[PDB]
Amino acid sequence: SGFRKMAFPSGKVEGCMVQVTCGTTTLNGLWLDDVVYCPRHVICTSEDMLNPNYEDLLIRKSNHNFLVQAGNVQLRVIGHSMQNCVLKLKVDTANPKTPKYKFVRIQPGQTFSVLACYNGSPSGVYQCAMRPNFTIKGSFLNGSCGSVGFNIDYDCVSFCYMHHMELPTGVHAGTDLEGNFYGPFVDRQTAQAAGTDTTITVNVLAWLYAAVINGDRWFLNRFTTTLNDFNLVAMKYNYEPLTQDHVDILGPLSAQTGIAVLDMCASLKELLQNGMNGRTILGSALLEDEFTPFDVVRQCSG
Amino acid sequence: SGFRKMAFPSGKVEGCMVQVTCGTTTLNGLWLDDVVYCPRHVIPNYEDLLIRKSNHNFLVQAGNVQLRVIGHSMQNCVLKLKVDTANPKTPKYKFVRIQPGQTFSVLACYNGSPSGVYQCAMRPNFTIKGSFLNGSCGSVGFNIDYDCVSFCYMHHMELPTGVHAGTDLEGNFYGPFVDRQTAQAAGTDTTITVNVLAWLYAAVINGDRWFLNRFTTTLNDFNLVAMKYNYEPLTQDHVDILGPLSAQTGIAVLDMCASLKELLQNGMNGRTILGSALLEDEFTPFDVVRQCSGVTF
Ligand SMILES: O=C1N(c2cncc3ccccc23)CCC[C@]12CCOc1ccc(Cl)cc12
Ligand SMILES: O=C1N(c2cncc3ccccc23)CCC[C@]12CCOc1ccc(Cl)cc12
């Protein structure tokens, strides 16, 4: 019993964190096999952050300009290439702590763990979700660039995010491990703004199922709804549309609790109209949207 | 920017998690040097039950390798299984007993394998509001200081309200609990006041100031109000501990106490603090400073 925001154990990722210094800029790198991955903005100077030409800046660099430190050992950079917004620094040593890994690009609503690092050293681990506006509400200070987002599947680390930027609203933007940004963001200091954020509906429903599995039933009602009527109500509360894929994904939780998806949707509609009335669901006075249907099943059943 | 419930990096502890099987019971053990620590309920008169066991009854598995048990002893509610091999991954560690209101990270394990890490606090009623299923016994709570892991908790049981109870690494239970199936209940819980104040400072540091007011209060008047809302008494030690946060934000502790008094008597009124409609009490003043300054391990 109990429902907590749970991160994946970070050990497999801690053994990959290195410090990358280029000139005055110091950030974190991900050392996998003989390659160190890091944000390409590590090459940027003061005069070139508004409109940097990364291809131009990188051609002027040599391998010895990149200082890579793994613990108290300096790694030797023997090559460098750029792949979208990520810099790939070929090094002379393969990381002995390299785990079984994959590079995966995630979709909004998906959750992951973040190992926040500064100077190549892990300082904390927390759970995040890719917001529908492609930002993440992280906990990042200056020096955390290159910190990674991941999930673990048996013994395989799926790297899904690398931190690059903080927007003016205090939210965060970054890329997958192939350097492709999530969202319409660019690694430039030009005026950028996070779009209006919306609640991840399928995740709120999964969390209501988690509450039912944990004994909470106060929010349940005798009503059902059509998928279209639910979406018409949901859109007015800035909730993401619920698709047939979402309904299908919620199937196992619906079978386990005996509450049809559209039946739980009618509970959510009521909660949106009424609020909680001094009550909590799983120790929260707000509807939690950073637990996916897959997280709920994993935490509740195994 | 940003404030998250953050756990310590779990790597140093992952390298210590092993599976302990005794008869039909399978749970987790902590392998430090040549000793595996686990809840004694893996084997009630525990001296009588243990005397009937031999070293070969305890099957200890570290990954896909079986360790050989060469001795066994009991220390309070923890079983210490002496093994032939010292854990090469043994980090710099201490066994520390924590106080209510202190926070720590839990590495939830099943079958000796880590499945998740989460941050939690030792409630004033000595329970933890964890997330544990059957098979998680022996999962540990810890803090990291520099390169030293301070082991502070080992999971033993779930109370009927879904909250959890356990021991320090010396086998002494937190709270008035016993490791036996009998009538046990978590006592009435209270809010960790110093932690709520630290979290209000974290909100100020992050730009959230709506709850601030011009008022101040005496420590005694604040304590009279706090007692009425099932909040722990705030001591001069707590006020002193909140000193650096008070200096950083320019808001005196008793000034922040007057904000908390108004939040208690009036509510949030549709507003939130750090994305929460409730007053969060599982961040200590040290956690807030650590997160709002980026201390690494
Ligand atoms: O966001 C950025 N940084 C930060 C990243 N994460 C958390 C931060 C918390 C406080 C201060 C800065 C933070 C550090 C690197 C540079 C920068 C500065 C702003 O201009 C840009 C524009 C684009 C890009 Cl890709 C990066 C940046
Ligand atoms: O609590 C217990 N278990 C559990 C521990 N943590 C999370 C659990 C989630 C669901 C089910 C059981 C859980 C494991 C088995 C032993 C047990 C069962 C109840 O009787 C007692 C009495 C005392 C002690 Cl020390 C342990 C137990």
Ligand SMILES: [Cl-]
């Ligand atoms: Cl995805």
Ligand SMILES: [Cl-]
């Ligand atoms: Cl302090």
